[PDB]
Swiss-Prot record, chain A:
The gene is rpmG. Belongs to the bacterial ribosomal protein bL33 family. One of its GO terms (biological process) is translation. PANTHER family: 50S RIBOSOMAL PROTEIN L33, CHLOROPLASTIC, LARGE RIBOSOMAL SUBUNIT PROTEIN BL33C. InterPro entries: Ribosomal_bL33, Ribosomal_bL33_CS, Ribosomal_bL33_sf, Ribosomal_zn-bd. This is Large ribosomal subunit protein bL33. GO terms for molecular function: structural constituent of ribosome. It comes from the Bacteria.
UniProtKB/Swiss-Prot annotation, chain B:
The gene is rpmB. The keyword Aminoacyl-tRNA synthetase does not apply. Gene3D superfamilies: 2.20.150.30, 3.30.160.850. This is Large ribosomal subunit protein bL28. It comes from Thermus thermophilus (strain ATCC BAA-163 / DSM 7039 / HB27). Transmembrane segments: none annotated. GO terms for molecular function: structural constituent of ribosome. Keywords: Ribonucleoprotein, Ribosomal protein. One of its GO terms (cellular component) is ribosome. GO terms for biological process: translation. The lineage of its organism: Bacteria, Thermotogati, Deinococcota, Deinococci, Thermales.
UniProtKB/Swiss-Prot annotation, chain C:
It comes from the Bacteria. Keywords: Repressor, Ribonucleoprotein, Ribosomal protein, RNA-binding, rRNA-binding, Translation regulation, tRNA-binding. This is Large ribosomal subunit protein uL1. Part of the 50S ribosomal subunit. GO terms for biological process: regulation of translation; translation. GO terms for molecular function: rRNA binding; structural constituent of ribosome; tRNA binding. NCBIfam families: rplA_bact. It comes from Thermus thermophilus (strain ATCC BAA-163 / DSM 7039 / HB27). Gene3D superfamilies: 3.30.190.20, 3.40.50.790. The gene is rplA. The keyword rRNA-binding applies. GO terms for cellular component: large ribosomal subunit.
RNA sequence: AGAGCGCAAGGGUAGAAGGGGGCCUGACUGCGAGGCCUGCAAGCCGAGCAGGGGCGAAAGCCGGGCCUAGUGAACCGGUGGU
RNA sequence: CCGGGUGGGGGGGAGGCGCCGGUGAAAUACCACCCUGGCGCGGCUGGGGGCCUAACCCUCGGAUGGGGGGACAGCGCUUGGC
RNA sequence: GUAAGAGGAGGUAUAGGGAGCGACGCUUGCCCGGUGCCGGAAGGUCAAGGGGAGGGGUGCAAGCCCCGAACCGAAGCCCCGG
RNA sequence: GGCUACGUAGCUCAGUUGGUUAGAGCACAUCACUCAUAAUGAUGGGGUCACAGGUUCGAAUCCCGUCGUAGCCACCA
């Protein structure tokens, strides 16, 4: 439900993506998880958009 | 009707006001799709000008009145006499 | 009498419908200072960011690639070790945590504060009713929370400026000092334009650069083609 | 093993799936042998390869949750990119 | 805000003020813009009323006109509603 | 009746159209909450229009074309009472 | 969706551009007055100004984020 809602994660260093979910209710401020983009190896990943 | 000048007779059905509701984009469209059909017809009016030896009227188009006064100008140039209202008015043009 | 005699002549030199730009302003407004001493070029800058917008009142922290000449003395509350740094900079009696009452128990003579982030916390909670509200205490962007804020002590001893918005963007850029002629006026004003464009809001539509009024301090000022 | 394993029951499980701590973020990418299932469609399962990544002394596990419900082909378009 | 501020006319005259100190959030001549509310105008831009007739419309024993209404009414296009 | 015009009526609020009841005798109680209807020159919402702060394509440029805020644009429904 | 207004004591309602010192009638409370109830006067309990954030030294008085309430236009592959 939109409370857990649905958001996506983009890398810094210009764009990139990966598919995820959230949980605003739970102590969920923002997120800087650590994944892999299409280009190169594993890196940052920043939280953004709907 | 039909103007005595440059035609200007009615228009019907798929003339239009349609209705529609129409498409664009303001989401998936303004309201997307939208569609219907209607009716539409011209203008006409009255110009009862004197000129020459008598008085005469006109069924003038929306914006073809200066043309009427022009016909007046051409009218003055010739011999417009006797008693014959629309009869003269026709010899005009 | 109303605006004085000096300002009636100095009125017959404004023609309140002019521009000058940074150039003619530099020169003729270098003249527009016949009053006392070191009139501060008061670039008076006004824009449009709705006198708060929650967090859009600039801060702009600038030195104007020259110098002022006045004094701030900083004081600093720099937890012993940081005192050392400030001790080769310009910070009077740096007092680790003790010159706090020489601010709080009524003993002024200072500006800025630089202090630290350490004591910031501590020393924030004490004088945040005077230096804070009025304009000295930390404001973590007014050159007052750090040890790289001592490099900033030299920054504040070469020019701080704290561009804020109050009710009109307003800010009064300070240099001019009626002893700088063409050169330093040109370069100073242009520099301020630079820092100006540097600190920008995130979507506040309008004229980012109306009022400039480049008044020395005692006279005329009419705009600078708010750009060049 | 009658406890627990979110939620209904069923299967199962203390040689762990349960309960405590440390590092983390494999709800990974490009693919997929060969099988479940089945009118179509869709759904289920997965070794390995390869990039690189977490943890592990290693051996090694990792394509979320012990598993079965928490789901909607297409047409329309919204939004970021190529 | 009943406290004084703001302005002009004058008498008359060589004399009258601003910082710190003091107080509080702030210090009060002067200078810069701006806000509050107002007031006058200049650009744009509308709301409301009167008078006029000559568009348009009514009528009176033929009327080239007199009398009534009149920029609405009638209509043409378009605008949203019911 | 698309219309010209027609009936109304060469009649004029004791006159003309629409509705409920149905001689005459008695009589016609409470509710304006939902709605219909009457009015009400403050106002919310909303149209094309009017306007132009602001953005873009493109030409070297002059320019051309599109997007468009503030704010003024009705009926109406909401609102107000009967 | 977009725009608008309101939500503060158990009830019902003001204080609204600050800067003070958060109220009113009902009701509860122990009284007072009357020989007697009621009428009314007094003192207390109840606000946690729709919840937070930020503006200010100092907001229930302002901008902002979430919801609840309603109003019209208006969206729904």
């Amino acid at each position: 439900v939109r409370i857990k809602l649905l958001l996506e994660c983009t890398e810094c260093k210009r764009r990139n993506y990966a598919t995820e979910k959230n949980k605003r209710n739970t102590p969920n401020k923002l997120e800087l998880r650590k994944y892999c983009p299409w280009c190169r190896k594993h890196t940052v990943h920043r939280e953004v958009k709907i | 009707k039909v103007c005595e000048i440059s035609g200007k007779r009615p228009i019907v059905a798929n003339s239009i006001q349609r209705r529609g509701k129409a498409k664009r984009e303001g989401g998936v469209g303004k309201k997307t799709t939208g569609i219907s059909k209607r009716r539409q017809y011209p203008n006409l009016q009255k110009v009862r000008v004197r000129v020459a030896g008598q008085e005469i009227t006109f069924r003038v188009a929306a914006s073809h009145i200066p043309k009427v006064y022009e016909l007046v100008e051409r009218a003055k140039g010739l011999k417009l006499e006797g008693l014959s209202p629309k009869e003269i008015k026709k010899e005009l043009l | 009498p109303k605006h004085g005699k000096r300002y009636r002549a100095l009125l017959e030199k404004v023609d309140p419908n002019k521009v000058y730009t940074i150039d003619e302003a530099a020169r003729l407004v270098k003249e527009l200072a016949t009053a006392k001493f070191d009139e501060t070029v008061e670039v008076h800058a006004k824009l449009g960011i709705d006198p708060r917008r929650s967090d859009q009142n600039v801060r702009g922290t600038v030195s104007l690639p020259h110098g002022l000449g006045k004094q701030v003395r900083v004081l600093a509350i720099a937890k012993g070790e940081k005192i050392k740094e400030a001790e080769e900079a310009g910070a009077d009696y740096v007092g680790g945590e003790e010159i706090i009452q020489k601010i709080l128990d009524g003993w002024m003579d200072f500006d800025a504060v630089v202090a630290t982030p350490d004591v910031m916390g501590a020393v924030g909670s004490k004088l945040g009713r005077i230096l804070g509200p009025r304009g000295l205490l930390p404001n973590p962007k007014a050159g007052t929370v750090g040890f790289n804020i001592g490099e900033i002590i030299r920054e504040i001893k070469a020019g701080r400026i704290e561009f804020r918005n109050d009710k009109t963007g307003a800010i009064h850029a300070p240099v001019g000092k009626a002893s700088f002629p063409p050169e330093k006026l040109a370069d100073n004003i242009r520099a301020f334009i630079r820092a100006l464009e540097a600190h920008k809001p995130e979507g506040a539509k309008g004229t980012f650069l109306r009022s400039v009024y480049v008044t020395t301090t005692m006279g005329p000022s009419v705009r600078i083609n708010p750009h060049s």
